[PDB]
């Protein structure tokens, strides 16, 4: 049995005095009325903040952490093995509607990896080299200067 | 497990491997959910006229004449819900979404589960079906798809000791209630489901309580009418094989 189902006979259906459930006055005004007065509590403050650059001057990087690549090297049997060598661009999803692919360095690298991507973070490089690996910058990656 | 194939005389004729799906653990809660959705999804939208009871300029006189403040016209009350001829306060509405969603996986699982319930003689007996057989479902040669006369499917069924179920479904019930005024006067037990491969069995369809289906599109409802698992079914050699991949 539901709460609603048990209201018949209660007269007020849980609203308290029958003088309560009337119009918007019982809500302190329609919608966000009073967000600056009687109901300012828990509303983000009034005001303008910052600016936005035009949508078409924005670049969206397609990222991936080494942890993800590394945890599935063996599993990526359909990808170069050598002295592994993986082209990140072929791993990352959303790597099409992306302005470029970037490898981030979260997690560990327990294998020797040769990574090819449009960009890398210090942490990603240090980790990939520290595990006896290398990081190759793509042609698009030739945008560093 | 093994599946004893039968010929059109009802005599054993070799046997095939009962596909794995018939081992899918029986989940009556999921089966029930699948049937519930299929039943909801074919219900039609309805609702009273948006303006029923509002076609009037009736007005309230207010205080002054020892009368309740009720809109009246020509000295007759109108519009308000407590008024005879007034609007329906919270009526059925066309806009209401009367359909039920169901994840494909949850649904397909229910299909597999209802399939499996079909291979359990005890379940099939509890569902209510009448029969004197130990093996189930009943598998038959693809030649069944060539039968043309209902009577012939009858003999085959009597030979397979399964005709008793049709005897069961050979009784209509004249329902209590006003469904009768809307064309729902009768209802009857569900009997044997015949699953073929090329086309539903035209020869078996008119049998009392029988339903015909095809392996590629047989669903939870025909496999478990009203959400109850374990329908006395009869597959076709090929049908049995197709169902395997569902």
């Amino acid at each position: 049995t539901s709460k609603k189902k048990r209201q018949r006979g209660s007269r007020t259906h849980g609203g308290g005095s029958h003088k309560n459930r009337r119009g918007a006055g019982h809500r302190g005004g329609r919608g966000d009325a009073g967000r600056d007065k009687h109901e300012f509590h828990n509303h983000e403050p009034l005001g303008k903040s910052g600016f936005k650059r035009p949508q078409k001057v924005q670049e969206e990087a397609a990222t991936i952490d080494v942890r993800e690549i590394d945890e599935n090297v063996t599993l990526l049997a359909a990808d170069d093995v050598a002295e592994f060598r993986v082209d990140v661009r072929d791993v990352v999803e959303e790597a099409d509607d992306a302005d470029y692919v970037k490898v981030l360095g979260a997690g560990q690298v327990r294998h020797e990896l040769t990574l090819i991507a449009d960009d890398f973070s210090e942490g990603a490089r240090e980790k990939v080299e520290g595990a006896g690996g290398s990081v190759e910058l793509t042609d698009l990656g030739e945008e560093r200067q | 497990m093994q599946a004893t194939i039968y010929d059109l005389d009802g005599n054993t004729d070799g046997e095939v491997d009962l596909p794995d799906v018939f081992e899918t653990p029986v989940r009556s809660d999921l089966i029930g959910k699948a049937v519930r959705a299929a039943q909801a999804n074919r219900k039609q939208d309805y609702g009273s006229d948006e303006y029923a009871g509002l076609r009037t300029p009736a007005e309230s006189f207010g205080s002054g004449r020892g009368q309740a403040h009720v809109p009246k016209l020509d000295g007759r009350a109108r519009r308000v819900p407590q008024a005879v001829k007034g609007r329906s306060a919270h009526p059925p509405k066309t806009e209401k979404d009367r359909s039920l969603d169901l994840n494909d996986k949850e649904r397909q699982l229910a299909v597999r589960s209802a399939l499996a319930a079909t291979a359990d003689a005890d379940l099939v007996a509890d569902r209510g079906h009448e029969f004197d057989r130990d093996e189930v479902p009943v598998v038959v040669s693809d030649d069944f798809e060539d039968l043309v006369k209902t009577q012939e499917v009858v003999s085959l069924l009597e030979a397979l000791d399964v005709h008793a179920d049709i005897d069961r479904a050979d009784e209509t019930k004249i329902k209590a209630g006003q469904g009768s005024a809307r064309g729902r006067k009768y209802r009857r037990p569900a009997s044997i489901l015949f699953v073929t491969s090329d086309e539903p069995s035209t020869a078996a369809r008119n049998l009392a309580g029988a339903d015909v289906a095809t392996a590629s599109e047989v669903n939870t409802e025909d496999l478990a009418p009203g959400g109850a698992p374990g329908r006395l079914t009869v597959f076709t050699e090929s049908a049995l094989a197709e169902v395997a991949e569902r």
Binding site: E71 | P25, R27, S28, D29
Partner: protein, 115 residues
């Protein structure tokens, strides 16, 4: 108000075992499965690999998921495993149903609970 008849039976079986046999885990696992689904365990392989040890059966009072890497040769018992989890685990160890666990070990000894 559980709906799954199987989950329901598992729960009753877990109890029968904690009562009859000297088990305490089974009753513990039973009480957690009785609690709301949102509280049931959802463990990835990375956690099993970090706290499990060989010859000690890992017991998940919920479901095991496939993220991370498992190398240890352990036996994991859970309510269910995702398809990938069960595949990765059987390559280095063994994925087992809580129903089998209760049978091969109704006393629930040498078990490690992971959530």
């Amino acid at each position: 108000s559980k709906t799954n008849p199987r989950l329901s039976s598992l729960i009753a079986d877990l109890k029968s075992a904690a009562r009859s046999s000297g088990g305490a885990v089974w009753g513990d696992v039973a009480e957690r499965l009785e609690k709301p689904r949102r509280t049931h365990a959802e463990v990835n392989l990375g956690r099993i690999e970090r706290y499990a040890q060989e010859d000690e059966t890992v017991v998940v009072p919920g479901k095991v998921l496939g993220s991370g890497v498992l190398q240890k040769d352990v036996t994991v018992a859970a309510v269910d495993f995702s398809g990938t989890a069960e595949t990765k685990i059987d390559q280095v160890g063994e994925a087992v149903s809580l129903e089998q666990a209760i049978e091969n070990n109704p006393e629930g000894s040498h078990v490690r609970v992971i959530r």
